[PDB]
Amino acid sequence: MDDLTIEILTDDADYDLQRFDCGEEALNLFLTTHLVRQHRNKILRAYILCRNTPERQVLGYYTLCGSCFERAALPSKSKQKKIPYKNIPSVTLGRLAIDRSLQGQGWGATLVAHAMNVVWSASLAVGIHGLFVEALNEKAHTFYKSLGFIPLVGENENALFFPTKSIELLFT
Amino acid sequence: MDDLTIEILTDDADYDLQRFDCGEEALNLFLTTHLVRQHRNKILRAYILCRNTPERQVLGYYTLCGSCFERNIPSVTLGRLAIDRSLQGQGWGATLVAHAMNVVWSASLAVGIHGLFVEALNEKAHTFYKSLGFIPLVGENENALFFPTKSIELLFT
Amino acid sequence: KQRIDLRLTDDDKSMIEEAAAISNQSVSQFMLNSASQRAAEVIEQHRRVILNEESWTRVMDALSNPPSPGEKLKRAAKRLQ
Amino acid sequence: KQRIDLRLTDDDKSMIEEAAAISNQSVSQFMLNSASQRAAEVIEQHRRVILNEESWTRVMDALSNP
Amino acid sequence: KQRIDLRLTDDDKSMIEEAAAISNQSVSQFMLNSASQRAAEVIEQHRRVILNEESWTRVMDALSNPPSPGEKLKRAAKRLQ
Amino acid sequence: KQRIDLRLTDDDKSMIEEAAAISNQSVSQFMLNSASQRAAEVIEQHRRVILNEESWTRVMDALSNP
């Protein structure tokens, strides 16, 4: 564990997968089949936390995708004018998993920071207002809440948000 | 002429369609170019006022079709109604409308129909229809009027 | 059976060909389907009366409190008999 | 000015001509306008998905190893 | 340009044949248009987030006055540097 | 049991693959389910239209006479 790095998945599909366990078998099985297939379809960008060795075993991963948001129905908008805005651009961090070996070691947080660094670098090339994450359960919810993510309520409950501006602030 | 009747278009197309003049070029031309083909394609049923002559001199007509109103609720509308110049000012239009209402009442006993819509191009037609009982409508429907089937039923008691 | 011959500009024909290719249809099939769908749509729309707030209220009122047939209409009906 | 011929069934023809009469048009005019309007809808929707894909590619390229 | 062989059950064939005939398309036309339109809307709906009144409010206020990065988050940011 | 030949355009194919991966299905499951649900919709609409034209026929007969 001297030699960890975070690399984008290289499309060759040449890592060591099934010897990976984070304790939640949804994330594990998502890595087993879904991650490489969803990556090669550019439905996501996979980032691999692995050792800088020839064997290259995986200790973590996260996924980034483009996304966009909208409001349900804008009322009383005869105020001055109405230039519609239908595809408001954002990025989603879909899922994030750490091998049980690296639990209790802040690696979740450093992966989150790395994703924010990727999103901030993209910020200067395309317009991106902020970063949603999905929190499937209580532990993920509070975890993301403790980094600054604002919870959304009501049928958007399982989603939190972080503005791109406060990402720029993180890297002053 | 004491020998005029009102009949469905009898699919004969055996009527004197050219001598008819009602005063309005649109209704005359609708008679001569559209009424027969639209009756045959079942977009409307055409009733003809004529006399029992060799060729049934056409002296007036009207059309009925299914419709519905919204914002499906079934209704009939009387689309077009026109009477020759010779018969005007004498109350023959009221008579055709009464006859159209009788057709719709008879239908309403076989099929659910809540009432009769009617179309009014100019203010002349609008005031005419308004004076038979029809309820004026407003806005994008200002050129339409309505008569509940219950009222038609009251008529024939 | 029946045949319709149609005239159109080069540009209209290119737009039609592109839309037929996107639809995975031939030019003839795309135009036929387009025309019959728009015809059906038009007929159905023509049979519907779309009432605004007040007109709807007035029709509903007429069905609740239907007017008595007026003198003029009574007399025309009597003229029928 | 080009020429295209279509063949219908009497049901379709009579329907097109009911619809033509209704919209104050000829049968020829009605069919041409129908195919043109619909071509426009189809092509605008196709362009929407191409433009969405262009957006997706820009952002996903930006999110890859920058 | 490409090909897919679908193996179909005899009932689904008769159903899809009825629907293709109703839309006067060939079976293959019907199936490929059905797949292509459904895939487009699945992708569109997957990428979009619809926000109700209050989630929208909180996202907006976040953009207006964005929050300061908390000490935990900054502490991880300085790890990966 | 049966057999069908379907040809697409590398764009259609990639897009179907992307949607199939989103919904955790095979590319065949996705194509079949899409065609099947769409055929359902279309037959249902055709049924509504048939019922509409029957009630149309019924009123138009009633307005001819008994």
mmCIF file with all atom_site columns, all heavy atoms in Angstrom, chain B residues 67-71 114 136 138 140-141 151 155, chain C residues 47-52 55 58 63 67 69 73 76:
data_model
loop_
_atom_site.group_PDB
_atom_site.id
_atom_site.type_symbol
_atom_site.label_atom_id
_atom_site.label_alt_id
_atom_site.label_comp_id
_atom_site.label_asym_id
_atom_site.label_entity_id
_atom_site.label_seq_id
_atom_site.pdbx_PDB_ins_code
_atom_site.Cartn_x
_atom_site.Cartn_y
_atom_site.Cartn_z
_atom_site.occupancy
_atom_site.B_iso_or_equiv
_atom_site.pdbx_formal_charge
_atom_site.auth_seq_id
_atom_site.auth_comp_id
_atom_site.auth_asym_id
_atom_site.auth_atom_id
_atom_site.pdbx_PDB_model_num
ATOM 1   N N   . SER B 1 67  ? -70.413 15.208 -32.946 1.00 0.00 ? 67  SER B N   1
ATOM 2   C CA  . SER B 1 67  ? -69.344 16.038 -32.423 1.00 0.00 ? 67  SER B CA  1
ATOM 3   C C   . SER B 1 67  ? -69.183 15.732 -30.946 1.00 0.00 ? 67  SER B C   1
ATOM 4   O O   . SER B 1 67  ? -69.973 14.990 -30.356 1.00 0.00 ? 67  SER B O   1
ATOM 5   C CB  . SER B 1 67  ? -69.675 17.498 -32.605 1.00 0.00 ? 67  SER B CB  1
ATOM 6   O OG  . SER B 1 67  ? -70.876 17.770 -31.906 1.00 0.00 ? 67  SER B OG  1
ATOM 7   N N   . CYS B 1 68  ? -68.185 16.355 -30.334 1.00 0.00 ? 68  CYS B N   1
ATOM 8   C CA  . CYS B 1 68  ? -68.074 16.278 -28.890 1.00 0.00 ? 68  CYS B CA  1
ATOM 9   C C   . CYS B 1 68  ? -67.412 17.539 -28.374 1.00 0.00 ? 68  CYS B C   1
ATOM 10  O O   . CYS B 1 68  ? -66.730 18.266 -29.107 1.00 0.00 ? 68  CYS B O   1
ATOM 11  C CB  . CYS B 1 68  ? -67.324 15.016 -28.427 1.00 0.00 ? 68  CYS B CB  1
ATOM 12  S SG  . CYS B 1 68  ? -65.941 14.584 -29.426 1.00 0.00 ? 68  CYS B SG  1
ATOM 13  N N   . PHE B 1 69  ? -67.666 17.815 -27.110 1.00 0.00 ? 69  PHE B N   1
ATOM 14  C CA  . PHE B 1 69  ? -67.114 19.011 -26.506 1.00 0.00 ? 69  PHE B CA  1
ATOM 15  C C   . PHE B 1 69  ? -66.237 18.608 -25.334 1.00 0.00 ? 69  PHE B C   1
ATOM 16  O O   . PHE B 1 69  ? -66.387 17.520 -24.782 1.00 0.00 ? 69  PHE B O   1
ATOM 17  C CB  . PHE B 1 69  ? -68.205 20.021 -26.097 1.00 0.00 ? 69  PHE B CB  1
ATOM 18  C CG  . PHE B 1 69  ? -69.386 19.429 -25.400 1.00 0.00 ? 69  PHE B CG  1
ATOM 19  C CD1 . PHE B 1 69  ? -69.558 19.624 -24.047 1.00 0.00 ? 69  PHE B CD1 1
ATOM 20  C CD2 . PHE B 1 69  ? -70.356 18.731 -26.100 1.00 0.00 ? 69  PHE B CD2 1
ATOM 21  C CE1 . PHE B 1 69  ? -70.673 19.108 -23.394 1.00 0.00 ? 69  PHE B CE1 1
ATOM 22  C CE2 . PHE B 1 69  ? -71.455 18.201 -25.451 1.00 0.00 ? 69  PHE B CE2 1
ATOM 23  C CZ  . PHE B 1 69  ? -71.625 18.403 -24.106 1.00 0.00 ? 69  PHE B CZ  1
ATOM 24  N N   . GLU B 1 70  ? -65.287 19.486 -24.997 1.00 0.00 ? 70  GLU B N   1
ATOM 25  C CA  . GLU B 1 70  ? -64.165 19.160 -24.126 1.00 0.00 ? 70  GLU B CA  1
ATOM 26  C C   . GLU B 1 70  ? -63.764 20.359 -23.280 1.00 0.00 ? 70  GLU B C   1
ATOM 27  O O   . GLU B 1 70  ? -64.154 21.496 -23.542 1.00 0.00 ? 70  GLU B O   1
ATOM 28  C CB  . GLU B 1 70  ? -62.935 18.727 -24.928 1.00 0.00 ? 70  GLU B CB  1
ATOM 29  C CG  . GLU B 1 70  ? -62.876 17.277 -25.314 1.00 0.00 ? 70  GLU B CG  1
ATOM 30  C CD  . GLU B 1 70  ? -61.608 16.968 -26.092 1.00 0.00 ? 70  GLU B CD  1
ATOM 31  O OE1 . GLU B 1 70  ? -61.141 17.874 -26.815 1.00 0.00 ? 70  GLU B OE1 1
ATOM 32  O OE2 . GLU B 1 70  ? -61.072 15.840 -25.971 1.00 0.00 ? 70  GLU B OE2 1
ATOM 33  N N   . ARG B 1 71  ? -62.912 20.072 -22.290 1.00 0.00 ? 71  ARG B N   1
ATOM 34  C CA  . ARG B 1 71  ? -62.195 21.034 -21.445 1.00 0.00 ? 71  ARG B CA  1
ATOM 35  C C   . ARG B 1 71  ? -63.106 22.070 -20.786 1.00 0.00 ? 71  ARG B C   1
ATOM 36  O O   . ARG B 1 71  ? -63.426 21.959 -19.586 1.00 0.00 ? 71  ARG B O   1
ATOM 37  C CB  . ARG B 1 71  ? -61.093 21.703 -22.256 1.00 0.00 ? 71  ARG B CB  1
ATOM 38  C CG  . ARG B 1 71  ? -60.668 23.070 -21.749 1.00 0.00 ? 71  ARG B CG  1
ATOM 39  C CD  . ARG B 1 71  ? -59.176 23.283 -21.871 1.00 0.00 ? 71  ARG B CD  1
ATOM 40  N NE  . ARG B 1 71  ? -58.449 22.325 -21.051 1.00 0.00 ? 71  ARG B NE  1
ATOM 41  C CZ  . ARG B 1 71  ? -57.127 22.183 -21.053 1.00 0.00 ? 71  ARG B CZ  1
ATOM 42  N NH1 . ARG B 1 71  ? -56.384 22.950 -21.838 1.00 0.00 ? 71  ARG B NH1 1
ATOM 43  N NH2 . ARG B 1 71  ? -56.541 21.278 -20.272 1.00 0.00 ? 71  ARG B NH2 1
ATOM 44  N N   . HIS B 1 114 ? -75.879 15.208 -25.785 1.00 0.00 ? 114 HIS B N   1
ATOM 45  C CA  . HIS B 1 114 ? -76.244 16.209 -24.790 1.00 0.00 ? 114 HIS B CA  1
ATOM 46  C C   . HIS B 1 114 ? -76.833 17.481 -25.364 1.00 0.00 ? 114 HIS B C   1
ATOM 47  O O   . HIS B 1 114 ? -77.458 18.237 -24.609 1.00 0.00 ? 114 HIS B O   1
ATOM 48  C CB  . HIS B 1 114 ? -75.054 16.571 -23.925 1.00 0.00 ? 114 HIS B CB  1
ATOM 49  C CG  . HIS B 1 114 ? -74.724 15.515 -22.925 1.00 0.00 ? 114 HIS B CG  1
ATOM 50  N ND1 . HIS B 1 114 ? -73.766 14.553 -23.154 1.00 0.00 ? 114 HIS B ND1 1
ATOM 51  C CD2 . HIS B 1 114 ? -75.242 15.253 -21.703 1.00 0.00 ? 114 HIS B CD2 1
ATOM 52  C CE1 . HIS B 1 114 ? -73.694 13.753 -22.104 1.00 0.00 ? 114 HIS B CE1 1
ATOM 53  N NE2 . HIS B 1 114 ? -74.580 14.154 -21.211 1.00 0.00 ? 114 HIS B NE2 1
ATOM 54  N N   . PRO B 1 136 ? -75.527 31.825 -26.724 1.00 0.00 ? 136 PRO B N   1
ATOM 55  C CA  . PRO B 1 136 ? -74.261 32.320 -27.265 1.00 0.00 ? 136 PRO B CA  1
ATOM 56  C C   . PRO B 1 136 ? -73.083 31.863 -26.426 1.00 0.00 ? 136 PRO B C   1
ATOM 57  O O   . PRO B 1 136 ? -73.183 31.644 -25.217 1.00 0.00 ? 136 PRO B O   1
ATOM 58  C CB  . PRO B 1 136 ? -74.419 33.842 -27.207 1.00 0.00 ? 136 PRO B CB  1
ATOM 59  C CG  . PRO B 1 136 ? -75.362 34.049 -26.054 1.00 0.00 ? 136 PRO B CG  1
ATOM 60  C CD  . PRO B 1 136 ? -76.321 32.882 -26.078 1.00 0.00 ? 136 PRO B CD  1
ATOM 61  N N   . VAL B 1 138 ? -68.531 32.265 -26.075 1.00 0.00 ? 138 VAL B N   1
ATOM 62  C CA  . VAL B 1 138 ? -67.634 33.387 -25.876 1.00 0.00 ? 138 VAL B CA  1
ATOM 63  C C   . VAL B 1 138 ? -66.229 33.004 -26.335 1.00 0.00 ? 138 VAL B C   1
ATOM 64  O O   . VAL B 1 138 ? -65.950 31.844 -26.650 1.00 0.00 ? 138 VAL B O   1
ATOM 65  C CB  . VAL B 1 138 ? -67.660 33.842 -24.398 1.00 0.00 ? 138 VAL B CB  1
ATOM 66  C CG1 . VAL B 1 138 ? -66.594 33.151 -23.580 1.00 0.00 ? 138 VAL B CG1 1
ATOM 67  C CG2 . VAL B 1 138 ? -67.574 35.330 -24.298 1.00 0.00 ? 138 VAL B CG2 1
ATOM 68  N N   . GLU B 1 140 ? -62.790 32.116 -27.988 1.00 0.00 ? 140 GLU B N   1
ATOM 69  C CA  . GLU B 1 140 ? -62.520 31.335 -29.190 1.00 0.00 ? 140 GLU B CA  1
ATOM 70  C C   . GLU B 1 140 ? -63.749 30.575 -29.683 1.00 0.00 ? 140 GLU B C   1
ATOM 71  O O   . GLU B 1 140 ? -63.699 30.007 -30.772 1.00 0.00 ? 140 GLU B O   1
ATOM 72  C CB  . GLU B 1 140 ? -61.360 30.361 -28.927 1.00 0.00 ? 140 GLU B CB  1
ATOM 73  C CG  . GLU B 1 140 ? -61.794 28.983 -28.360 1.00 0.00 ? 140 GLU B CG  1
ATOM 74  C CD  . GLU B 1 140 ? -60.991 28.498 -27.126 1.00 0.00 ? 140 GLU B CD  1
ATOM 75  O OE1 . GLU B 1 140 ? -60.531 29.342 -26.322 1.00 0.00 ? 140 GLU B OE1 1
ATOM 76  O OE2 . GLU B 1 140 ? -60.848 27.260 -26.958 1.00 0.00 ? 140 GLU B OE2 1
ATOM 77  N N   . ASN B 1 141 ? -64.842 30.542 -28.907 1.00 0.00 ? 141 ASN B N   1
ATOM 78  C CA  . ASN B 1 141 ? -66.097 29.912 -29.301 1.00 0.00 ? 141 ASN B CA  1
ATOM 79  C C   . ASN B 1 141 ? -67.196 30.931 -29.583 1.00 0.00 ? 141 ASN B C   1
ATOM 80  O O   . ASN B 1 141 ? -68.374 30.556 -29.662 1.00 0.00 ? 141 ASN B O   1
ATOM 81  C CB  . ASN B 1 141 ? -66.579 28.943 -28.218 1.00 0.00 ? 141 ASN B CB  1
ATOM 82  C CG  . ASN B 1 141 ? -65.500 27.970 -27.774 1.00 0.00 ? 141 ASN B CG  1
ATOM 83  O OD1 . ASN B 1 141 ? -65.115 27.934 -26.598 1.00 0.00 ? 141 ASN B OD1 1
ATOM 84  N ND2 . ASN B 1 141 ? -65.010 27.166 -28.716 1.00 0.00 ? 141 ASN B ND2 1
ATOM 85  N N   . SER B 1 151 ? -83.954 20.818 -23.941 1.00 0.00 ? 151 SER B N   1
ATOM 86  C CA  . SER B 1 151 ? -84.812 21.861 -24.505 1.00 0.00 ? 151 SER B CA  1
ATOM 87  C C   . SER B 1 151 ? -85.510 21.391 -25.774 1.00 0.00 ? 151 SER B C   1
ATOM 88  O O   . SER B 1 151 ? -86.705 21.644 -25.953 1.00 0.00 ? 151 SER B O   1
ATOM 89  C CB  . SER B 1 151 ? -84.010 23.131 -24.779 1.00 0.00 ? 151 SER B CB  1
ATOM 90  O OG  . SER B 1 151 ? -83.963 23.955 -23.628 1.00 0.00 ? 151 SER B OG  1
ATOM 91  N N   . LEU B 1 155 ? -89.569 21.138 -26.566 1.00 0.00 ? 155 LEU B N   1
ATOM 92  C CA  . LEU B 1 155 ? -90.178 21.641 -27.791 1.00 0.00 ? 155 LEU B CA  1
ATOM 93  C C   . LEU B 1 155 ? -91.309 20.740 -28.274 1.00 0.00 ? 155 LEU B C   1
ATOM 94  O O   . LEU B 1 155 ? -92.415 21.211 -28.572 1.00 0.00 ? 155 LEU B O   1
ATOM 95  C CB  . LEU B 1 155 ? -89.093 21.783 -28.862 1.00 0.00 ? 155 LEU B CB  1
ATOM 96  C CG  . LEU B 1 155 ? -89.463 22.341 -30.229 1.00 0.00 ? 155 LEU B CG  1
ATOM 97  C CD1 . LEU B 1 155 ? -90.124 23.711 -30.065 1.00 0.00 ? 155 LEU B CD1 1
ATOM 98  C CD2 . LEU B 1 155 ? -88.211 22.417 -31.094 1.00 0.00 ? 155 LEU B CD2 1
ATOM 99  N N   . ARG C 2 47  ? -64.095 17.079 -35.450 1.00 0.00 ? 47  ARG C N   1
ATOM 100 C CA  . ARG C 2 47  ? -65.301 16.660 -34.748 1.00 0.00 ? 47  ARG C CA  1
ATOM 101 C C   . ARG C 2 47  ? -65.341 17.151 -33.297 1.00 0.00 ? 47  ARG C C   1
ATOM 102 O O   . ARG C 2 47  ? -66.427 17.206 -32.727 1.00 0.00 ? 47  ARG C O   1
ATOM 103 C CB  . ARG C 2 47  ? -65.449 15.133 -34.862 1.00 0.00 ? 47  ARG C CB  1
ATOM 104 C CG  . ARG C 2 47  ? -65.172 14.695 -36.302 1.00 0.00 ? 47  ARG C CG  1
ATOM 105 C CD  . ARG C 2 47  ? -65.724 13.347 -36.755 1.00 0.00 ? 47  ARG C CD  1
ATOM 106 N NE  . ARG C 2 47  ? -65.149 12.220 -36.051 1.00 0.00 ? 47  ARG C NE  1
ATOM 107 C CZ  . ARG C 2 47  ? -64.934 11.014 -36.580 1.00 0.00 ? 47  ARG C CZ  1
ATOM 108 N NH1 . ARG C 2 47  ? -65.248 10.768 -37.848 1.00 0.00 ? 47  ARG C NH1 1
ATOM 109 N NH2 . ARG C 2 47  ? -64.400 10.054 -35.828 1.00 0.00 ? 47  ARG C NH2 1
ATOM 110 N N   . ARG C 2 48  ? -64.205 17.572 -32.709 1.00 0.00 ? 48  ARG C N   1
ATOM 111 C CA  . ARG C 2 48  ? -64.127 18.023 -31.309 1.00 0.00 ? 48  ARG C CA  1
ATOM 112 C C   . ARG C 2 48  ? -64.381 19.529 -31.169 1.00 0.00 ? 48  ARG C C   1
ATOM 113 O O   . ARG C 2 48  ? -63.858 20.328 -31.943 1.00 0.00 ? 48  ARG C O   1
ATOM 114 C CB  . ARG C 2 48  ? -62.761 17.692 -30.692 1.00 0.00 ? 48  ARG C CB  1
ATOM 115 C CG  . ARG C 2 48  ? -62.351 16.190 -30.650 1.00 0.00 ? 48  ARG C CG  1
ATOM 116 C CD  . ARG C 2 48  ? -61.061 15.913 -29.806 1.00 0.00 ? 48  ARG C CD  1
ATOM 117 N NE  . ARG C 2 48  ? -59.831 16.460 -30.406 1.00 0.00 ? 48  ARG C NE  1
ATOM 118 C CZ  . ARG C 2 48  ? -58.887 17.163 -29.764 1.00 0.00 ? 48  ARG C CZ  1
ATOM 119 N NH1 . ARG C 2 48  ? -58.980 17.423 -28.463 1.00 0.00 ? 48  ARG C NH1 1
ATOM 120 N NH2 . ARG C 2 48  ? -57.825 17.600 -30.434 1.00 0.00 ? 48  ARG C NH2 1
ATOM 121 N N   . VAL C 2 49  ? -65.179 19.912 -30.175 1.00 0.00 ? 49  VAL C N   1
ATOM 122 C CA  . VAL C 2 49  ? -65.393 21.311 -29.815 1.00 0.00 ? 49  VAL C CA  1
ATOM 123 C C   . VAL C 2 49  ? -64.658 21.537 -28.508 1.00 0.00 ? 49  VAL C C   1
ATOM 124 O O   . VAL C 2 49  ? -64.971 20.887 -27.502 1.00 0.00 ? 49  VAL C O   1
ATOM 125 C CB  . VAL C 2 49  ? -66.891 21.658 -29.654 1.00 0.00 ? 49  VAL C CB  1
ATOM 126 C CG1 . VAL C 2 49  ? -67.067 23.112 -29.288 1.00 0.00 ? 49  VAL C CG1 1
ATOM 127 C CG2 . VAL C 2 49  ? -67.721 21.328 -30.887 1.00 0.00 ? 49  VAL C CG2 1
ATOM 128 N N   . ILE C 2 50  ? -63.703 22.451 -28.508 1.00 0.00 ? 50  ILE C N   1
ATOM 129 C CA  . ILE C 2 50  ? -62.862 22.694 -27.344 1.00 0.00 ? 50  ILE C CA  1
ATOM 130 C C   . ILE C 2 50  ? -63.330 23.995 -26.714 1.00 0.00 ? 50  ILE C C   1
ATOM 131 O O   . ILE C 2 50  ? -63.185 25.073 -27.301 1.00 0.00 ? 50  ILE C O   1
ATOM 132 C CB  . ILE C 2 50  ? -61.374 22.734 -27.712 1.00 0.00 ? 50  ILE C CB  1
ATOM 133 C CG1 . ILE C 2 50  ? -60.962 21.405 -28.352 1.00 0.00 ? 50  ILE C CG1 1
ATOM 134 C CG2 . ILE C 2 50  ? -60.518 22.995 -26.475 1.00 0.00 ? 50  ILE C CG2 1
ATOM 135 C CD1 . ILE C 2 50  ? -59.463 21.231 -28.514 1.00 0.00 ? 50  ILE C CD1 1
ATOM 136 N N   . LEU C 2 51  ? -63.919 23.891 -25.528 1.00 0.00 ? 51  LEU C N   1
ATOM 137 C CA  . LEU C 2 51  ? -64.585 25.014 -24.882 1.00 0.00 ? 51  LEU C CA  1
ATOM 138 C C   . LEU C 2 51  ? -63.670 25.640 -23.841 1.00 0.00 ? 51  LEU C C   1
ATOM 139 O O   . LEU C 2 51  ? -63.045 24.934 -23.048 1.00 0.00 ? 51  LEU C O   1
ATOM 140 C CB  . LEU C 2 51  ? -65.890 24.558 -24.215 1.00 0.00 ? 51  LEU C CB  1
ATOM 141 C CG  . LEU C 2 51  ? -66.941 23.978 -25.163 1.00 0.00 ? 51  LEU C CG  1
ATOM 142 C CD1 . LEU C 2 51  ? -68.131 23.414 -24.425 1.00 0.00 ? 51  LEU C CD1 1
ATOM 143 C CD2 . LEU C 2 51  ? -67.386 25.058 -26.086 1.00 0.00 ? 51  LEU C CD2 1
ATOM 144 N N   . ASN C 2 52  ? -63.607 26.965 -23.836 1.00 0.00 ? 52  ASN C N   1
ATOM 145 C CA  . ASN C 2 52  ? -62.911 27.666 -22.774 1.00 0.00 ? 52  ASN C CA  1
ATOM 146 C C   . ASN C 2 52  ? -63.764 27.683 -21.500 1.00 0.00 ? 52  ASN C C   1
ATOM 147 O O   . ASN C 2 52  ? -64.909 27.222 -21.483 1.00 0.00 ? 52  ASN C O   1
ATOM 148 C CB  . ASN C 2 52  ? -62.559 29.078 -23.236 1.00 0.00 ? 52  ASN C CB  1
ATOM 149 C CG  . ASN C 2 52  ? -63.785 29.914 -23.538 1.00 0.00 ? 52  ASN C CG  1
ATOM 150 O OD1 . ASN C 2 52  ? -64.831 29.785 -22.893 1.00 0.00 ? 52  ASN C OD1 1
ATOM 151 N ND2 . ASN C 2 52  ? -63.661 30.782 -24.527 1.00 0.00 ? 52  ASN C ND2 1
ATOM 152 N N   . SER C 2 55  ? -67.413 29.341 -21.817 1.00 0.00 ? 55  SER C N   1
ATOM 153 C CA  . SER C 2 55  ? -68.287 28.576 -22.701 1.00 0.00 ? 55  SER C CA  1
ATOM 154 C C   . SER C 2 55  ? -68.680 27.259 -22.058 1.00 0.00 ? 55  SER C C   1
ATOM 155 O O   . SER C 2 55  ? -69.842 26.834 -22.141 1.00 0.00 ? 55  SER C O   1
ATOM 156 C CB  . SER C 2 55  ? -67.594 28.333 -24.043 1.00 0.00 ? 55  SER C CB  1
ATOM 157 O OG  . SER C 2 55  ? -67.301 29.557 -24.708 1.00 0.00 ? 55  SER C OG  1
ATOM 158 N N   . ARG C 2 58  ? -71.258 27.868 -19.504 1.00 0.00 ? 58  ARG C N   1
ATOM 159 C CA  . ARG C 2 58  ? -72.565 28.148 -20.090 1.00 0.00 ? 58  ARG C CA  1
ATOM 160 C C   . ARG C 2 58  ? -73.230 26.873 -20.596 1.00 0.00 ? 58  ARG C C   1
ATOM 161 O O   . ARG C 2 58  ? -74.438 26.678 -20.411 1.00 0.00 ? 58  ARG C O   1
ATOM 162 C CB  . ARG C 2 58  ? -72.426 29.171 -21.207 1.00 0.00 ? 58  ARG C CB  1
ATOM 163 C CG  . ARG C 2 58  ? -72.256 30.603 -20.700 1.00 0.00 ? 58  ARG C CG  1
ATOM 164 C CD  . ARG C 2 58  ? -72.012 31.531 -21.872 1.00 0.00 ? 58  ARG C CD  1
ATOM 165 N NE  . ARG C 2 58  ? -71.759 32.921 -21.499 1.00 0.00 ? 58  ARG C NE  1
ATOM 166 C CZ  . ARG C 2 58  ? -72.023 33.929 -22.311 1.00 0.00 ? 58  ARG C CZ  1
ATOM 167 N NH1 . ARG C 2 58  ? -72.546 33.653 -23.500 1.00 0.00 ? 58  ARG C NH1 1
ATOM 168 N NH2 . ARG C 2 58  ? -71.795 35.188 -21.949 1.00 0.00 ? 58  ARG C NH2 1
ATOM 169 N N   . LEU C 2 63  ? -77.412 22.637 -19.579 1.00 0.00 ? 63  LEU C N   1
ATOM 170 C CA  . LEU C 2 63  ? -77.829 21.266 -19.256 1.00 0.00 ? 63  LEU C CA  1
ATOM 171 C C   . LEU C 2 63  ? -78.491 21.176 -17.884 1.00 0.00 ? 63  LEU C C   1
ATOM 172 O O   . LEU C 2 63  ? -79.319 20.283 -17.656 1.00 0.00 ? 63  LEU C O   1
ATOM 173 C CB  . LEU C 2 63  ? -76.640 20.303 -19.310 1.00 0.00 ? 63  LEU C CB  1
ATOM 174 C CG  . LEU C 2 63  ? -75.777 20.107 -20.563 1.00 0.00 ? 63  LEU C CG  1
ATOM 175 C CD1 . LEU C 2 63  ? -74.630 19.171 -20.196 1.00 0.00 ? 63  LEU C CD1 1
ATOM 176 C CD2 . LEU C 2 63  ? -76.530 19.558 -21.772 1.00 0.00 ? 63  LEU C CD2 1
ATOM 177 N N   . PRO C 2 67  ? -83.345 26.145 -21.193 1.00 0.00 ? 67  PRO C N   1
ATOM 178 C CA  . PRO C 2 67  ? -84.378 27.150 -21.465 1.00 0.00 ? 67  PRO C CA  1
ATOM 179 C C   . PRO C 2 67  ? -85.649 26.511 -22.008 1.00 0.00 ? 67  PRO C C   1
ATOM 180 O O   . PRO C 2 67  ? -85.622 25.431 -22.606 1.00 0.00 ? 67  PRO C O   1
ATOM 181 C CB  . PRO C 2 67  ? -83.722 28.068 -22.506 1.00 0.00 ? 67  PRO C CB  1
ATOM 182 C CG  . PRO C 2 67  ? -82.593 27.262 -23.092 1.00 0.00 ? 67  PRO C CG  1
ATOM 183 C CD  . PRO C 2 67  ? -82.136 26.323 -22.016 1.00 0.00 ? 67  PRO C CD  1
ATOM 184 N N   . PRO C 2 69  ? -88.442 26.383 -24.819 1.00 0.00 ? 69  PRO C N   1
ATOM 185 C CA  . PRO C 2 69  ? -88.488 26.789 -26.234 1.00 0.00 ? 69  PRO C CA  1
ATOM 186 C C   . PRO C 2 69  ? -89.222 28.118 -26.414 1.00 0.00 ? 69  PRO C C   1
ATOM 187 O O   . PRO C 2 69  ? -90.309 28.326 -25.869 1.00 0.00 ? 69  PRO C O   1
ATOM 188 C CB  . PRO C 2 69  ? -89.231 25.626 -26.907 1.00 0.00 ? 69  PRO C CB  1
ATOM 189 C CG  . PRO C 2 69  ? -88.914 24.416 -26.008 1.00 0.00 ? 69  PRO C CG  1
ATOM 190 C CD  . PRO C 2 69  ? -88.851 24.978 -24.613 1.00 0.00 ? 69  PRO C CD  1
ATOM 191 N N   . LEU C 2 73  ? -89.488 29.537 -32.062 1.00 0.00 ? 73  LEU C N   1
ATOM 192 C CA  . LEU C 2 73  ? -89.160 28.138 -32.324 1.00 0.00 ? 73  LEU C CA  1
ATOM 193 C C   . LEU C 2 73  ? -90.386 27.245 -32.164 1.00 0.00 ? 73  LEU C C   1
ATOM 194 O O   . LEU C 2 73  ? -90.575 26.289 -32.937 1.00 0.00 ? 73  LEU C O   1
ATOM 195 C CB  . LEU C 2 73  ? -88.027 27.675 -31.410 1.00 0.00 ? 73  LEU C CB  1
ATOM 196 C CG  . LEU C 2 73  ? -87.660 26.217 -31.654 1.00 0.00 ? 73  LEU C CG  1
ATOM 197 C CD1 . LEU C 2 73  ? -87.191 26.067 -33.092 1.00 0.00 ? 73  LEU C CD1 1
ATOM 198 C CD2 . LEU C 2 73  ? -86.615 25.731 -30.665 1.00 0.00 ? 73  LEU C CD2 1
ATOM 199 N N   . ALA C 2 76  ? -92.288 27.550 -35.357 1.00 0.00 ? 76  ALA C N   1
ATOM 200 C CA  . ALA C 2 76  ? -91.698 26.819 -36.473 1.00 0.00 ? 76  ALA C CA  1
ATOM 201 C C   . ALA C 2 76  ? -91.993 25.328 -36.361 1.00 0.00 ? 76  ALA C C   1
ATOM 202 O O   . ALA C 2 76  ? -92.333 24.676 -37.357 1.00 0.00 ? 76  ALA C O   1
ATOM 203 C CB  . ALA C 2 76  ? -90.194 27.067 -36.536 1.00 0.00 ? 76  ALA C CB  1
#
